[PDB]
Design an enzyme around this catalytic site. Structure first.
Site, mmCIF file in Angstrom:
data_model
loop_
_atom_site.group_PDB
_atom_site.id
_atom_site.type_symbol
_atom_site.label_atom_id
_atom_site.label_comp_id
_atom_site.label_asym_id
_atom_site.label_seq_id
_atom_site.Cartn_x
_atom_site.Cartn_y
_atom_site.Cartn_z
ATOM 1 N N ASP A 352 0.815 -1.228 0.000
ATOM 2 C CA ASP A 352 0.000 0.000 0.000
ATOM 3 C C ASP A 352 0.849 1.279 0.000
ATOM 4 O O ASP A 352 0.453 2.266 -0.614
ATOM 5 C CB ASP A 352 -0.982 0.016 1.186
ATOM 6 C CG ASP A 352 -2.200 -0.891 1.043
ATOM 7 O OD1 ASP A 352 -2.550 -1.251 -0.106
ATOM 8 O OD2 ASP A 352 -2.803 -1.235 2.077
ATOM 9 N N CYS A 386 -1.784 2.927 -12.919
ATOM 10 C CA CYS A 386 -1.872 2.695 -11.475
ATOM 11 C C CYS A 386 -3.091 3.501 -10.970
ATOM 12 O O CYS A 386 -4.202 3.198 -11.397
ATOM 13 C CB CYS A 386 -0.567 2.944 -10.688
ATOM 14 S SG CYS A 386 0.227 4.565 -10.956
ATOM 15 N N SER A 387 -2.907 4.479 -10.103
ATOM 16 C CA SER A 387 -3.946 5.345 -9.552
ATOM 17 C C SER A 387 -3.888 6.696 -10.305
ATOM 18 O O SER A 387 -4.847 7.076 -10.980
ATOM 19 C CB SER A 387 -3.688 5.557 -8.063
ATOM 20 O OG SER A 387 -2.322 5.912 -7.889
ATOM 21 N N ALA A 388 -2.743 7.394 -10.187
ATOM 22 C CA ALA A 388 -2.457 8.694 -10.817
ATOM 23 C C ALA A 388 -1.689 8.545 -12.138
ATOM 24 O O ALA A 388 -1.627 9.483 -12.932
ATOM 25 C CB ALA A 388 -1.670 9.571 -9.846
ATOM 26 N N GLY A 391 3.481 7.394 -10.299
ATOM 27 C CA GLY A 391 4.379 6.758 -9.338
ATOM 28 C C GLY A 391 4.841 5.353 -9.656
ATOM 29 O O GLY A 391 6.020 5.119 -9.956
ATOM 30 N N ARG A 392 3.917 4.400 -9.525
ATOM 31 C CA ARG A 392 4.112 2.985 -9.832
ATOM 32 C C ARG A 392 4.264 2.791 -11.327
ATOM 33 O O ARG A 392 5.131 2.044 -11.754
ATOM 34 C CB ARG A 392 2.895 2.196 -9.383
ATOM 35 C CG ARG A 392 2.863 1.944 -7.938
ATOM 36 C CD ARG A 392 1.620 1.188 -7.646
ATOM 37 N NE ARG A 392 1.211 1.518 -6.299
ATOM 38 C CZ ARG A 392 0.227 0.927 -5.647
ATOM 39 N NH1 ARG A 392 -0.469 -0.041 -6.224
ATOM 40 N NH2 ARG A 392 -0.053 1.281 -4.404
#
Ligand SMILES: O=c1c(Cc2ccccc2)c(O)nc2sc3cc(Cl)ccc3n12
Length: 448
Positions: A352, A386-388, A391-392
């Site tokens: 997480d 990923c989410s945004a 990052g990942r």
């Protein structure tokens, strides 16, 4: 406005003595926004974005500061003098070592209390210019005295020094990171050394030329999962109504995108189809720590769903330890001959917060993804979300790019991790979010 090696007290005194009201700085603490009475505002980045307390989420610290200076007042940036995060700054180094390292326009500033500007000239020679430091200001022996070595370098980058016999001492470019594959030794030296090299990369954020106009439009705000995290207009995916928070990454091509929203599911399938992408890399769970990161844009196994004008079939699901693989089938509603397989590699074992302890699993995942992409003739960019989508997504595309080089050249190739990150950031701001991810990219390339 970013100060890499200061404390809360040092910042508080700096803003009270060398500053006024509206004066602000930023520093590592996890970051803190110290504004002037002096207030300390926390910035957290666990790997997805910069979350300011009682503020908003951003791709970069510079995007954050640019936003609050435009819309607790951020008015005057209190400039930093420490040259540690500058590319040209070597600190401790001798003349001979600097001469040998430099062996056109290539420069460096090395280190009683005085500094040395070593510059290469040719089509060749190495010119050493002394920098005297008297009562905190810097100078080349005469003329203007500078508040920092930064002001000096940038003044001489614009206005080069003319040698007695007409030699132009051009300040063109500062390379101390392009290691040959071999990596083991470099990882040992950077073990911190990684944080130092990471913040040097961070100091290069504002050098990048990009616009964020289309994403800032009225009709497109609802289409953004995070209002401030937007795609670069020169590399954005235009759908042929035309908007998606996605960018094409060209070093195999990738599409970096955010996790699907309920109102962007149809636009995501319009993009995959148009781009002729046959591989999706999902590096997030649908829900993490009770917050939704991506909506289910794929049907249940054996099910068939219509997503606007697109039709998707989930053929078979195959579970592995770290990930699930879904065999999807995409076609336009109306024309049967438009069908193609889309393979979605959904990585589920990413923590997480932070990064995995071992990159083995990520490296098995990317290896599978690469061979599935290489097995498909005329295949489009690899979609990565990923989410945004910074990052990942950024850590996965960078590790994938670097291992792509080591696959085509072997243990005898020249790799430069920060150079690769900066190049990806030129296509979507914020790619690779934290120092932990940065270090994980090195560890991944090492383990490979
Ligand atoms: O910035 C650059 C550029 C220029 C550049 C500009 C846009 C896109 C790609 C490359 C370049 O050739 N090489 C390097 S090595 C290096 C190391 C660190 Cl820590 C930081 C930066 C950095 N850097």
């Amino acid at each position: 406005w970013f100060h890499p090696n200061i404390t809360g007290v040092e910042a508080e005194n700096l803003l009270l003595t060398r500053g006024v009201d509206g004066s602000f700085l930023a520093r590592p603490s996890d970051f803190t926004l110290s504004v002037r009475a002096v207030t300390h505002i926390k910035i957290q980045n666990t790997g997805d974005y910069y979350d300011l307390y009682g503020g908003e989420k951003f791709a970069t610290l510079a995007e954050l500061v640019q936003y609050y200076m435009e819309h607790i007042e951020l008015k005057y940036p209190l400039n930093c003098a420490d040259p540690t995060s500058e590319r040209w700054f070597h600190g401790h180094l001798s003349g001979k070592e600097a001469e040998k390292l430099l062996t056109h326009g290539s420069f460096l500033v090395r280190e009683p209390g005085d500094f040395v500007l070593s510059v290469r000239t040719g089509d060749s020679k190495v010119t050493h210019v002394m920098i005297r430091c008297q009562e905190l200001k810097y100078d080349v022996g005469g003329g203007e005295r500078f508040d920092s070595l930064t002001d000096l370098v940038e003044h001489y980058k614009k206005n080069p020094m003319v040698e007695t016999l007409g030699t132009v001492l051009q300040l063109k470019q500062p390379n101390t990171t392009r290691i040959n594959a071999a990596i083991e030794s470099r990882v040992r030296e950077l073990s911190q050394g990684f944080w130092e090299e990471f913040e040097t990369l961070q100091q290069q954020e504002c050098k990048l030329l990009y616009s964020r106009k289309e994403g800032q439009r009225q009709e497109n705000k609802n289409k953004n999962r995070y209002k401030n995290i937007l795609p670069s207009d020169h590399t954005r995916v235009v759908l042929h109504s035309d908007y998606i928070n996605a960018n094409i990454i060209m070093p195999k091509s990738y599409i970096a995108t955010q996790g699907c929203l309920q109102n962007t599911v149809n636009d995501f399938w319009r993009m995959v189809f148009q781009e002729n992408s046959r591989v999706i890399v999902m590096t997030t769970k649908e829900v993490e720590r009770g917050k939704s990161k991506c909506v289910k844009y794929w049907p249940d196994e054996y099910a068939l769903k219509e997503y606007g004008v697109m039709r998707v079939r989930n053929v078979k699901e195959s579970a592995a330890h770290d990930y699930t693989l879904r065999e999807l089938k995409l076609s336009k509603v109306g024309q049967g001959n438009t069908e193609r397989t889309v393979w979605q590699y959904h990585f589920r074992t990413w923590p997480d917060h932070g990064v995995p302890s071992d990159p083995g699993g990520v490296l098995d995942f990317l290896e599978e993804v690469h061979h599935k992409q290489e097995s498909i003739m005329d295949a489009g960019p690899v979609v990565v979300h990923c989410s945004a989508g910074i990052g990942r997504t950024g850590t996965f595309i960078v590790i994938d790019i670097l291992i792509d080089i080591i696959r085509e050249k072997g243990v005898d190739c020249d790799i430069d991790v920060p150079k690769t990150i900066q190049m990806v950031r030129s296509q979507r701001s914020g790619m690779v979010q934290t120092e932990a991810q940065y270090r994980f990219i090195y560890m991944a390339v090492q383990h490979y």
